[PDB]
Structure formats: structure tokens, C-alpha cells
Amino acid sequence: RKAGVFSDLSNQELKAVHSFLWSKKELRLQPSSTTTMAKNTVFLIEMLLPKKYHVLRFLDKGERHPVREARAVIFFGDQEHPNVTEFAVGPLPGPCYMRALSPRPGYQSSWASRPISTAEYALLYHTLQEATKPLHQFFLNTTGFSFQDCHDRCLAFTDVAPRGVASGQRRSWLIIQRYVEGYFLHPTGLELLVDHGSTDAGHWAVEQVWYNGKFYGSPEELARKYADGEVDVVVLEPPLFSSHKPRGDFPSPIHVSGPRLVQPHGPRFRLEGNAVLYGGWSFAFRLRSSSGLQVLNVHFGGERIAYEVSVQEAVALYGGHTPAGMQTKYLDVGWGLGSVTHELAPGIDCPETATFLDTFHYYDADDPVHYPRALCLFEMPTGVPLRRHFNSNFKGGFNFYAGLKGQVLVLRTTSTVYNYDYIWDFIFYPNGVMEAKMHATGYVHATFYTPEGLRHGTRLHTHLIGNIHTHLVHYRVDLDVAGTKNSFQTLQMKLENITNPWSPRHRVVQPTLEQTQYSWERQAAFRFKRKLPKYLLFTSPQENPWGHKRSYRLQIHSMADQVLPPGWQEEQAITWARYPLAVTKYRESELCSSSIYHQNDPWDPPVVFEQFLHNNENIENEDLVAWVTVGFLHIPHSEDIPNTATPGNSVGFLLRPFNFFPEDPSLASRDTVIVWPRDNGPNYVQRWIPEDRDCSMPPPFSYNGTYRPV
Amino acid sequence: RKAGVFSDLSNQELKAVHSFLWSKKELRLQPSSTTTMAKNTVFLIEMLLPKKYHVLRFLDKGERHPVREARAVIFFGDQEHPNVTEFAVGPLPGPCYMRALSPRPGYQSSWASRPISTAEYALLYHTLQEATKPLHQFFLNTTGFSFQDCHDRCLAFTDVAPRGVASGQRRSWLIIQRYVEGYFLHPTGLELLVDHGSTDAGHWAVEQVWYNGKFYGSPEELARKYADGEVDVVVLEDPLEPPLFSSHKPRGDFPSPIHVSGPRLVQPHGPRFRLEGNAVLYGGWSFAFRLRSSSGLQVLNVHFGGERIAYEVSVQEAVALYGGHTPAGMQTKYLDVGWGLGSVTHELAPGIDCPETATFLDTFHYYDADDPVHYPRALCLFEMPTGVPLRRHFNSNFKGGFNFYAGLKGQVLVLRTTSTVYNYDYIWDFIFYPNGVMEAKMHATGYVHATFYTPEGLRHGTRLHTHLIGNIHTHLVHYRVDLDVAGTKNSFQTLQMKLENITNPWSPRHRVVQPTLEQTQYSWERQAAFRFKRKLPKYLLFTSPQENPWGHKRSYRLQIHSMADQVLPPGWQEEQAITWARYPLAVTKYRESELCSSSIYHQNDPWDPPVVFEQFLHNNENIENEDLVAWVTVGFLHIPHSEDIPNTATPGNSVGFLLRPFNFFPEDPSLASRDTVIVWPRDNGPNYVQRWIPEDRDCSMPPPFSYNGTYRPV
Numbered sequence A: 001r002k003a004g005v006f007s008d009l010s011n012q013e014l015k016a017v018h019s020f021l022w023s024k025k026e027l028r029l030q031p032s033s034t035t036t037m038a039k040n041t042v043f044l045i046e047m048l049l050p051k052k053y054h055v056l057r058f059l060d061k062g063e064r065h066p067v068r069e070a071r072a073v074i075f076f077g078d079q080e081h082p083n084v085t086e087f088a089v090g091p092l093p094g095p096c097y098m099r100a101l102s103p104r105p106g107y108q109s110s111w112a113s114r115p116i117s118t119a120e121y122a123l124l125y126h127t128l129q130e131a132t133k134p135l136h137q138f139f140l141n142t143t144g145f146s147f148q149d150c151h152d153r154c155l156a157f158t159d160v161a162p163r164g165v166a167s168g169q170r171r172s173w174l175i176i177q178r179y180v181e182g183y184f185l186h187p188t189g190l191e192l193l194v195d196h197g198s199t200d201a202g203h204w205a206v207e208q209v210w211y212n213g214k215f216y217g218s219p220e221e222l223a224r225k226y227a228d229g230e231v232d233v234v235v236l237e238p239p240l241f242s243s244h245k246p247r248g249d250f251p252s253p254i255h256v257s258g259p260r261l262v263q264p265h266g267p268r269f270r271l272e273g274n275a276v277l278y279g280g281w282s283f284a285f286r287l288r289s290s291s292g293l294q295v296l297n298v299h300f301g302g303e304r305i306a307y308e309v310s311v312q313e314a315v316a317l318y319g320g321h322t323p324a325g326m327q328t329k330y331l332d333v334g335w336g337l338g339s340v341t342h343e344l345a346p347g348i349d350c351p352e353t354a355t356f357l358d359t360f361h362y363y364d365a366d367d368p369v370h371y372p373r374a375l376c377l378f379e380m381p382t383g384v385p386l387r388r389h390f391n392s393n394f395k396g397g398f399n400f401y402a403g404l405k406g407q408v409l410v411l412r413t414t415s416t417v418y419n420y421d422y423i424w425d426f427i428f429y430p431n432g433v434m435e436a437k438m439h440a441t442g443y444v445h446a447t448f449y450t451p452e453g454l455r456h457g458t459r460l461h462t463h464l465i466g467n468i469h470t471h472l473v474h475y476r477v478d479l480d481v482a483g484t485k486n487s488f489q490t491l492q493m494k495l496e497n498i499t500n501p502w503s504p505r506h507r508v509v510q511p512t513l514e515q516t517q518y519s520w521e522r523q524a525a526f527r528f529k530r531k532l533p534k535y536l537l538f539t540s541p542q543e544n545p546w547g548h549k550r551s552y553r554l555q556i557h558s559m560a561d562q563v564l565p566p567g568w569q570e571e572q573a574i575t576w577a578r579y580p581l582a583v584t585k586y587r588e589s590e591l592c593s594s595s596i597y598h599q600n601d602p603w604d605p606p607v608v609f610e611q612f613l614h615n616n617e618n619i620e621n622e623d624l625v626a627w628v629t630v631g632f633l634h635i636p637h638s639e640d641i642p643n644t645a646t647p648g649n650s651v652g653f654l655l656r657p658f659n660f661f662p663e664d665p666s667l668a669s670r671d672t673v674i675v676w677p678r679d680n681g682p683n684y685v686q687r688w689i690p691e692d693r694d695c696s697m698p699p700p701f702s703y704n705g706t707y708r709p710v
Numbered sequence B: 001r002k003a004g005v006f007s008d009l010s011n012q013e014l015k016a017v018h019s020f021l022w023s024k025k026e027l028r029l030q031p032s033s034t035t036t037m038a039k040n041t042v043f044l045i046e047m048l049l050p051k052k053y054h055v056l057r058f059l060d061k062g063e064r065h066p067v068r069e070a071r072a073v074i075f076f077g078d079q080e081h082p083n084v085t086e087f088a089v090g091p092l093p094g095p096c097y098m099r100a101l102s103p104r105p106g107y108q109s110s111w112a113s114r115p116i117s118t119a120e121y122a123l124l125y126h127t128l129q130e131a132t133k134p135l136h137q138f139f140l141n142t143t144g145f146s147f148q149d150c151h152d153r154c155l156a157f158t159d160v161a162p163r164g165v166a167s168g169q170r171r172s173w174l175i176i177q178r179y180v181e182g183y184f185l186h187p188t189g190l191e192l193l194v195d196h197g198s199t200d201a202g203h204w205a206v207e208q209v210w211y212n213g214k215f216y217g218s219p220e221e222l223a224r225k226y227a228d229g230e231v232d233v234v235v236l237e238d239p240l241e242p243p244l245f246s247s248h249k250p251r252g253d254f255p256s257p258i259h260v261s262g263p264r265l266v267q268p269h270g271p272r273f274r275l276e277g278n279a280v281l282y283g284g285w286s287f288a289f290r291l292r293s294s295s296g297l298q299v300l301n302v303h304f305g306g307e308r309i310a311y312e313v314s315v316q317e318a319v320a321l322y323g324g325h326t327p328a329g330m331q332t333k334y335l336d337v338g339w340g341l342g343s344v345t346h347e348l349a350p351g352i353d354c355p356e357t358a359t360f361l362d363t364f365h366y367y368d369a370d371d372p373v374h375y376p377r378a379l380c381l382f383e384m385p386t387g388v389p390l391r392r393h394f395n396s397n398f399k400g401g402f403n404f405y406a407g408l409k410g411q412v413l414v415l416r417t418t419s420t421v422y423n424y425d426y427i428w429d430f431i432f433y434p435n436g437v438m439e440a441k442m443h444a445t446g447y448v449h450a451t452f453y454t455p456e457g458l459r460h461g462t463r464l465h466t467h468l469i470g471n472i473h474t475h476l477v478h479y480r481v482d483l484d485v486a487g488t489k490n491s492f493q494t495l496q497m498k499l500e501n502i503t504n505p506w507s508p509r510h511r512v513v514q515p516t517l518e519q520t521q522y523s524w525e526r527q528a529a530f531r532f533k534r535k536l537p538k539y540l541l542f543t544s545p546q547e548n549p550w551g552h553k554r555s556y557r558l559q560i561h562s563m564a565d566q567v568l569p570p571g572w573q574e575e576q577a578i579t580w581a582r583y584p585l586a587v588t589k590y591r592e593s594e595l596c597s598s599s600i601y602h603q604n605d606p607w608d609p610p611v612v613f614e615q616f617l618h619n620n621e622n623i624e625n626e627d628l629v630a631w632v633t634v635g636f637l638h639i640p641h642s643e644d645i646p647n648t649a650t651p652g653n654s655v656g657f658l659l660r661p662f663n664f665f666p667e668d669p670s671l672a673s674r675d676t677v678i679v680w681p682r683d684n685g686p687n688y689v690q691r692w693i694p695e696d697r698d699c700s701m702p703p704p705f706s707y708n709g710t711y712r713p714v
């Protein structure tokens, strides 16, 4: 396919890139699994998109297939001055070069900036096990659990990030928890700060300890004060509160399964590889291991609407009474947001009738890993007609009833980084409207209860505070409305007050249409202080048959506000969250608003979205990129136990045609039904697809749950 | 059954009330259809809810069933000083009184304020046929259609409201249109202003004429100037192979053919909700519902977990406020309760309007009718998968496997009706999720309000076809949300995030700038009347004094989904009719004299209506430990665009709000659901799929499609 230009790497390709790099013996490559930080390893391999200039020549002007390459992130820890360096490896097939990417003169913290890995976690656990030995009796008395000879009663930890107070530090606060079903909700009241910056884990140290509201300096000191009675201790078969297992009873119990979708005539969309056709729609998709889901080269009616719509970052920003809590600003691209695309359970995560798609990731692994049912694609009834009208004759009857059943195409994946489960949707309606949606579920990020915690959260159980936080998500929306060069305008209603033209002594105070043009980037960078104009329009200079510019409208569904003070420390990592909408001129050097490095060096990251606006460029008839921030404040509440639920917990945006088509583009749909009356006879039910009452069975439920090399 | 207290009038009850009034010969009642305005007629009969005090004592304290009554609106046209007077007729069964209802002594303009009727429309058509005789040749030449001697090429009109420039006037602008398929979108360029205030239709006059950008004084004057070649006329093409642009008939082809039917719901096990009369049980939920003929859908006595959450959530008003270049366009402020928003609940098409698996419900309305009228499939109630899990988690072991996967399939219960007043089809949903979340939603579809294109119209709308402007407007909807959170006595508080700037407690040379949780308490109505200029706090909480087991007040959170803003200037003329639209949220102390924010009379006397919402805030009452009522304005600006042809579509054109428990329950109330599935690993074995309901693969069929399309007495 042509859409293959946008496709993620196959298992064959990942092996080819990996083998190529491994045959370069001077890289001294070792497996991700090797239990030392003092090693060189390939941390991530994923497809590296070609330049847009070359892609559009191939797609639109019949030129050469662009060169295909892989981005390869290499952790160089086996050298005097450790760093991370990225390369473009190509061509594919038949790799033979390795070209260094994105140099950064004067930046010294690339090593400290890197994501945590499985090997690093194992070394942290060992550090923890050793360092907390003096606390063994303290653990047994207070929790009934421990790190030693613990078996089914083991302590665990959750690290928070960022990890220190300045660029170059790798000092993590660790929340100690009981490792039981839903361990996230079982903090013991102990937190530990561990310096794990050295490539020699022998050097790693607990530098500070916090327990039940007091700092202690070391595990030995806490152990001593415990022994001398100078510590205020909290000593910690229905289901566990942190379990999903049912309990309680509805006043009106429900004993049977609810209604389900059947698809006896098979999918109405066509999936070939990473390429989808659906009525008027055509698009390609990919699942970028670093940043997550994208749709690319989106067309309706054979015309381009958007070159790229992509998830860029997903953040959860906390306050807290405990050190771990006040430390937490999670930026999930730093945890491989697009690589934790775990198995979709048929019937639950997508309809039983969905098409489930597998993929492969190479992220912190020894070999490419198979991820079954990583995505799904499905049509489902929306339960509301796309359009309907009852045309009454106002004398007890009707001229006609017309209706179009509501259907939507949904491309879906998830990310479960750790405790959060985010459900990522791109949704395509038959009338050319597309929607992006993120739904939040899974376990809340929580810390140990003390009275002081009630200033930064809610008590959810006996020992549990749900910390206040804001979720924010950034999308890149590279609209190319009917072609590459667009303009941006907004529309507002403004009142006029005129003489009533048929009654001169009176006034008419009424709506008029007010149009605002935007010439320069800064004018189109909307802050949260300003109210957003109601119509956000991306226009083609082409006019429709009625004289109006062909356009697509962006409509944001969000509750987001300004969270961090602009200019203050870690806020440098998320300057995009200043803007619910910002428009930039397309540049190859500005493809992403975040990176895998932002989480662990938010102070001096390699991409600062705000910098994209510094040159305040002209945006009249240019390749424009819309960037959208959506989010919501989440003050936890008892109903979040065991999990946050999806209803009302979604954000996103709509893209709607606005004077783009001559009339409703869903008019081509043959699903429409019109009912007409006949004189002294039955009504005529006019259809273009026969009525269907066929039923069928979906595959029986299965779930694997493992993700392994092939 | 107890929910009967909330039930709409039966066909038998409506007849009983109509019969009782007709038996009083001094009322001189004539049928609605009699084509004179100088008549006495019963315009509307509907159930009149008993006092909350009495309903609650019945429902909660074992006291007597409250007396059942009907509201009866009587048009007294057959007298020297015509008026509209309402009565409460009761008891039911066995009506033997008619007491005064909503008396407004000292008000004189009730007649002018009254809704238009089928009979009045017929007299308007007759007036136009006569008044426009001079324009007959003009009509035939410019449109190919006529008012006089027409059969299949008839001109029609669409009247706009309000009908004048001050209280007491009934002067309507009429948009003249060709009566073809989707006639709404076929204006001729002519608009006529008719004074139809007199009860003698012989006095009615076309007082002004607008055609293609100029005013003309009379039909005779336009006819003369046309004859003398002095008018720039627009000759419309003949509208009567391809569908008319205003038809829903398909045209064009998708580049990727869709020839088979899409996926559809099956319900082999039947409804999981228990619907009995107007009472519904659904897992945690219990509620009653009704469809008030005047104002529309209501859910009542809403409980979850055996505790009351809301005494009433109801539609109050639905408005479309226009601008325009034509006089009709610039006049239009439609308030749909003045047109019987609750009475235009036309037949829902199975498989389209609701799923084929839905339970469809008939009702009866008595609104501008000679007899109670049967409305087939006025409502539907159905459960549908949402396509998104209510909750799910993959608990990875971070080494190629998992500890468990847990998920709960997404389902929701939807109670739905529609209102097709004229051109708009509004779809009204109340939605109930198994975790105690409820949602109110309105979806807009149908035909836009449109006027004749001229270049000047581009300042107030969008050219949608050759001769067609879609006028700019804002949709505004008002809801009454009488939350009774765990009981009648509530308070209202909001939560905001506020940053603090403190010394980093483990690194003294540094700062922690972080979120804290800030709580604001509200004491008086005015403090909780949030205007559209004001930032709406992110957490709007209606609280009960009772705490959950973790020490937090039990509450329900109101979350608004809207794009609405201030449309009319506060205090200016017709804005008096929609002062509720100043507030996305306002909170009032409960009162029997303040049950409604609008009325059927607001549309035609917006200057001096019987209820001004702002007056509910005047006395600035205490709202601590009180029976509170939340009132919610939602809406959107709609600038029409060519994709609105032939109809506005529902995607991205809905508004509403959510109610969500906030520390009301000790933990997730969906935990009682047996639909939850947890998959667990086993060493050297297949996974154990833990269930509490057996896996379903069953099949069934719904009934074959039928549609009637008529609504008549039985």
C-alpha cells in the first residue's frame, strides 16, 4: 500500500535494525535485561517518519517512495561519561547506516534524563531490601509485611517523578506499599528518597526517610526512634477494597447479560494493513511506541482533511502532604505511552464484534515483543440518529418521516503506564465529523493518610488519601484542509442595535456575524485566561458552491485551566499546557511537543513548545499545525475505589466540516430510511438496504495476557 | 403503585376532565377546531402535580395519597374582554370542582400572550389568500406557485414570534415559502406582517410587505410597482430525476461502498430494567417519569442505592434566538414551550430514533385538540452498550505477563423522547449509568430556520443554497434540577485547586509550588447565581450534612457540558422572557410558586411574562440546610453551514449536564454489578476467567419495522 509509508515496524524489521546495531561490536551492546546500569543498550526502536515534503510528493505527485528508517535510542552507560544518543538507522529493508540525531551542544544531563528500565527497578528493589534491613521488625509490627522472607506478604514500592530538584539529578521518592491485589491503594506510611544516579548501583543510597508525617534521615534512625518509643506508629473473606470483585447488592439485582452488538454481515469498513476505508473516509494509522496513537493522511470524499492527528503527551500533576505526593508530575511519554498497549478484552474494552489488531514494540526489551489485541477497530451504533425529521401535516398525520441511524467507526488503543488506564479513541462519523477522545480509568495515584493530607486530597479509605491532580493531554492536529496551505480564522456573534426598519420608534438588538483573521503565530496562541472563540476555523482559499471558504472547525471538549505558573521550574516541560489552542507554521524541527526525556529532566528538556512561537511567524496561507490541550481537574472521591470510572471522565475535541462540502456528505449513505404516507393504504417504507434481522455469535471470549517475543 | 402520583393523565382521565368542563354550560365551550377566535375553548389539559410536601409525606411517611388534579387552560374568546384563565380540575377520579390556578389579577394582556392554534392558522391562510390577490400574477411569474386556486403548487408560510414590539400586540411576520418537500428551505423572498389581534378575523390586515430587500407598505403597492417594471425580482426555478436539495433522499456515492446493514443491538434476555407504568428500576436506580404536555420530559423521585438524589429533573424551556437581514429573521426569538414542546412527541422509528430492542411507549396529549389524541411511540426506554468500559485495569507484572485483567462492560439506560415543534427536531435524553451517574442531554437535528438570500444576509447568516440563508442563532435550554441529596435539606459548596508556594521540606534551599484543595461555602442565593462572565468553579457540589465513612460530606456533583454564553443584553426588552439565560447555574430555595422558569405564554408576551426567573433571586434567601433547586442553562451558538443541508445533524450538536456522586457512597456503587470480569493467570495452565454472570452468545430478533405516522383520538 501507499499507506505503508506510515506503518510501524514489523517484527522482521525490528529484528533487522537490532541485528544491524549488534553487529557493530564497538557499540558494546548488551541486553536490556542485564542487571547493571554500566552498559550500552538499545532502549527503543520505532519507525522514524519521513519528511512531509517527500511523503506528499510520493502520495500526491507520483514520485519515489520515501526512504524508510528506524529511530534507535541508545543508552551509552558503558563509558566514562554516560549519555543517551539517538540515531536514524536505514534504509529498510537492508540497513547499512546509522546517522546521529538531534545534537544538543552544552547539555550535560542526558543520562539523568533517561527513562527508568526494568533492570533499574530490580537494582532499586535490591538497594531497598538492603537499606531497610534495620526496619525489618518495624515492618512486621506495623504492616505484617516485609522485604525479607516475605513470600505472599511482601512490601513493594511506587516511584514518583521527576527525581530531584534540578537538571542532572536522579533522586526518586519511593512510596512503600503492601503488595496485594490492587497494591496501588495500600500505602504503609513510609516513603524513601533514593539517589540512584551512579552507574554503579553499589553507590546508591537512601538519603532521606519519611514516616507518618516526620522526616528521619535514615532507616537506622527511624529504627532507633521506633525502639525507643519515639515514633507515632500506625499499625495497618469479602473482597479487598482494592479489588474489582463484586460486593454489595443493588436494590433491583440484575441477573442476566445486557444487550450486545452483532455484526452478521461483517465489517463495513475495509482494513488493509495500517490503511482504513469507511464510507467517505480514508486514513492510515500508527501506534508510535514513544508517544502513542496517530491517524495520518486523513481524507473524506477523496480530499485531504488532516495530514496527522496524534497523541503527544499525557500528564498527571499532583499536590501532596507527603514528599512523594508533592513531588509527582507524571509525564507518560517518559514511560513509553505507546508501548503499554496491553491486551484489549473482547466484549469489554471493545465490542465482541470488533476487529482486534496485534503489534510489536521494542521498548526496554531484549527482543521485539508481540502485543496481542493492542488496538481494535469497530463500527458501533451511537444510539442517536445522525439526522431525523418528522414532517407533520399538522392535521393528525405526516408528509414523511426521514431518519439515518447513527453509526460510528472507532479506532482504539490504551495505555496502562502503571496505575492509570487511558483509553485512546479516534472516532469517524459518516458525515465527515471526526473526534478524538481519551477516557480515564484504572487506579488513582494515592498516598498514606494523615490529617494534613486533607489540604491536598480526599480520604478514600482508612489509610488512604487520593491526591488532588490535573490530567492534561496534548494533541498535535496537523490539519491540511483540502491541501497543505491553509489560513486560520474565528467567528463570534456580536450584537448590533439598529432602528427597527418597520417601526422606526423601536430598536432591533440582534446577533451579527463577526469574523477575525489571524496573521501571526502569537495572535493564534490562545491562553487559558482568554475565553476561546466559539468557532475555530481552518480554511482553504477554495470556496464551496455558495461562496464560503471551505473549512474544518475545531471544537474542544475540556475542563482544563492553567495548572503551573508559567516560567516556574518544572513548568518548562509543559509549556504547551499554557494553550488550549496554539497554531504553528509547520517545521520538521517541531514535530513533537514532548519527548521520553521530559519526565526526568523537566527543568531543561530538549523540546520547549513555547519556543515554537518565539519567531512569531506569518500564518497566512501556510502549512499550519493546530496543537490542542485538553484535561480536567480530578479531586478524588470515595467512588474512585477501587478504580476511577469512565463516565464523565473523558476529554478531547471534534473536527467538523464547515462549508467544506456543498451539502451534508452523509447524503451518500444508503442506510437512510424515509416513510411516506399512501392514500387509504399502508405507508411506503423507502429503503436502499434491505431490512435485516439476522443474528450471529461472536467468537467465544478468550484472553491471553502475556506479551512476548516471536 | 406509588409512582402513579407522578403519572400523566390517561385517555379516560382526559375525557373525564373535558366532559366535566363541557357539562358547565355557562362556559359555552366550543371545539378547538371551530374556525373563529371568538370562541370559548379548552386549549390544554394535563396532570397538575400535587404539592411536594404532600407527595413526600405519601412517599416517605406512609400518609395519604395526594389528591389528583388536572390543569385546564381555557381560552375565553367569546366575550367583550377576551382572556386566558387556568383552572385546577379535580378530584380524579370524579371531577367536581374547578379552582383558580396561577391567578394573575391586574394583568390585562393574557389574550395577546396566548399560543397560536390550528384554527388561527386556517384564518391566517384565508386572510393571506384575500390580502394577496393583487400579487397573484406576481406569484405565478416569480415562483410558479400561488395562494389562490392552488393544488400541488401552493405557497405556504412560516410565522415567526414574538409578534410585535410590545406587550399586547399580535402582529406576526410571515416568511412566504413554496410548499414542497422540506418547504422550510424554500423561501420566495416575500415576507408579510399581519395584525391578527382582533377576535374578528375580518379585521385582520397585512400591514407591511417586504420583498427582496425593500419594504412596500401593501400588497397592492408591490403589485403596482412590479407591473410598472420597478421591482428587481428573483424568478425561482421550477422545483417540481435527482432529489430536491431539501430532501433526505440519498445522492452521491461513497468511494468505499457500504451495501450491508451495520452492526445492531440484540437483546435475547430482554430488558434488564423493570419498567412498569411510569416507574423504572435499573440496578441501583429507581425513578418515575412523565411527559408534561406543556414543558416536556421529567424524571421524578430519582433514587440510587435506595436513597433519594433528585426530586425532579425537568426540561423548562428551549429557545432559538436569531439575527437576520429580513424583518422575519430579525424578529425571531422562538420559545418552544409556547408551542407545546411536550406535545410534539411524534412517533419514534424503531432502529433509527431508538434501537430496535427498545421498549416504545405511547401517550395521550390534549393540546389544541377536539379530543385527547393518541401519540404512538412518544417515548422509548432502552439499555445500550456505550462501547467503552465503565472501568478496566490491566495489572501488569512488568515481565511479559500480568497479575490480572479486570473490566466491566459499559452499559447505560436511556429514557428518550423528542420534540418536533415545526422545523427543529430536538432529541431529549435522560441517561443512567450503573455507577450512579446521570446525564441530561439534548441533541439538535431537523431543518434550520432559514430566510431568503440577499448579500446583506451574510452579516447575519450563511448562504446555504441559491436563494437560501441559514440565519445565525443560539440554542438555549433551561433545566430544573431539584436535587434532594439524601433528603430535602442540602447545602451548596464548590471546590477549586489553588497553588501554594512553600519551602521544600526535604531540600530547604528549594520551593514546592503545588496544588491545594480550596473549598468555598455558599450562604445566600445571589452567591450561587453564576453569570456567564464569571469563571464556573470546577466542582459544583450539592451536599447533605451526613458524612461517608471517611469523614467527607455526602454529595452530588453537577457538571455542565455547554458552549452557551450571554446572548441578549440583561434588562433589554424581550430578555425579560429569558432571564434564566443569564445563569449557567443558579440555586434557589424551593417554593411551590416557583416550580417553572417559563410558561406557554412567554413566547407571545416576552416583555411582561407571568414568570421572571430573576425575581426568584431578588429576596436572596439563605441556602444553608435548605431545600435547594439548581437551575441549569445549556446551549450553543449555531452559525449555519452548507453541511446543514438538508438537516442539521447530531454529531457535536448536543448539550446537557452530568450528575455524579461525590463522596456519597463508601466506594464505587457499580461494584454490585455481576457483569464484572476478572481474568487471572495460572502456572502452566490456561487463564481462569472469573465471572458472576455466564458468558452470553444467545441470539434473538426484534419485531419487523413498522411505522404509523398518525396521531388521533381513541
Ligand SMILES: *[C@@H]1O[C@H](CO)[C@@H](O[C@@H]2O[C@H](CO)[C@@H](O[C@@H]3O[C@H](CO)[C@@H](O)[C@H](O)[C@@H]3O)[C@H](O)[C@H]2NC(C)=O)[C@H](O)[C@H]1NC(C)=O
Binding pocket: B076, B079, B082, B083, B084, B085, B105, B106, B107
Ligand atoms: C376572564 O374571563 C372569565 C370568563 O369570562 C372571567 O370570569 C368570569 O367573571 C364574570 C364576571 O366577574 C363572572 O360572571 C358572573 O357575574 C355575575 C354578576 O354580574 C355573578 O353574579 C355570577 O355569579 C358570575 O360570577 C363569572 O363567574 C366568571 N366566570 C368564570 C368561569 O370564572 C374572568 O373574571 C376574566 N378574568 C379577568 C382578569 O378579567
Ligand SMILES: *[C@@H]1O[C@H](CO)[C@@H](O[C@@H]2O[C@H](CO)[C@@H](O)[C@H](O)[C@H]2NC(C)=O)[C@H](O)[C@H]1NC(C)=O
Binding pocket: A027, A076, A079, A082, A083, A084, A085, A100, A104
Ligand atoms: C555520547 O556517547 C557517544 C558514544 O560514546 C559518543 O559518540 C561517540 O563519540 C566518539 C568520540 O567522538 C566517536 O569517535 C564515536 O564514533 C561516537 N560513537 C557513536 C556510536 O556514534 C558521543 O560523543 C556522546 N554524545 C555527546 C553529546 O556527548
Ligand SMILES: *[C@@H]1O[C@H](CO)[C@@H](O[C@@H]2O[C@H](CO)[C@@H](O)[C@H](O)[C@H]2NC(C)=O)[C@H](O)[C@H]1NC(C)=O
Binding pocket: A497, A498, A507, A509, B569, B572
Ligand atoms: C439601543 O440604542 C438605543 C438608541 O441609541 C438606546 O436607547 C436610548 O437609551 C437612552 C438611555 O436609556 C434613552 O434616553 C434614549 O432616549 C434612547 N433612545 C432611543 C432612540 O430609544 C438603547 O438603550 C440601546 N439598547 C441597548 C441594549 O444597547
Ligand SMILES: *[C@@H]1O[C@H](CO)[C@@H](O[C@@H]2O[C@H](CO)[C@@H](O)[C@H](O)[C@H]2NC(C)=O)[C@H](O)[C@H]1NC(C)=O
Binding pocket: A565, A568, B501, B511, B513
Ligand atoms: C515562591 O516563593 C519564593 C520565595 O519567596 C520566590 O522566590 C524568590 O524569587 C525572587 C525573584 O522574584 C528572588 O529574588 C528570591 O531570591 C527568591 N527567594 C527564594 C527564597 O528563593 C518564588 O519566585 C516563588 N515562586 C512563585 C511561582 O510564586
Ligand SMILES: *[C@@H]1O[C@H](CO)[C@@H](O[C@@H]2O[C@H](CO)[C@@H](O)[C@H](O)[C@H]2NC(C)=O)[C@H](O)[C@H]1NC(C)=O
Binding pocket: A703, A704, A705, A706, A708, A709, B685, B686, B687
Ligand atoms: C498466550 O500466548 C502464547 C504465545 O502464543 C502461548 O504460548 C504458546 O503456546 C503454544 C500452544 O501450546 C505453544 O506451542 C508454544 O510453545 C507457546 N509459545 C510461547 C512463546 O510460549 C500461551 O499458551 C498463551 N497463554 C494462554 C494463557 O492462553
Ligand SMILES: *[C@@H]1O[C@H](CO)[C@@H](O[C@@H]2O[C@H](CO)[C@@H](O)[C@H](O)[C@H]2NC(C)=O)[C@H](O)[C@H]1NC(C)=O
Binding pocket: A681, A682, A683, B707, B708, B709, B710, B712, B713
Ligand atoms: C395507524 O394506526 C391507526 C390507529 O390504530 C390505524 O387506523 C385503524 O386502521 C384499522 C385498519 O387497519 C381500522 O380498523 C381502524 O378503523 C383505524 N382506526 C382509526 C382511528 O383510524 C392505521 O391503520 C395505522 N396506519 C398505518 C399507515 O399503519
Ligand SMILES: [Ca+2]
Binding pocket: A521, A584, A585, A612, A613, A614, A615, A616, A617
Ligand atoms: Ca514558529
Ligand SMILES: [Ca+2]
Binding pocket: A307, A478, A479, A480, A481, A484, A586, A623, A624, A625
Ligand atoms: Ca497543516
Ligand SMILES: [Ca+2]
Binding pocket: B525, B588, B589, B615, B616, B617, B618, B619, B620, B621
Ligand atoms: Ca429566592
Ligand SMILES: [Ca+2]
Binding pocket: B311, B482, B483, B484, B485, B488, B590, B627, B628, B629
Ligand atoms: Ca431540593
Ligand SMILES: [Cu+2]
Binding pocket: A440, A444, A469, A471, A634, A644
Ligand atoms: Cu485522575
Ligand SMILES: [Cu+2]
Binding pocket: B444, B448, B473, B475, B638, B648
Ligand atoms: Cu441551530
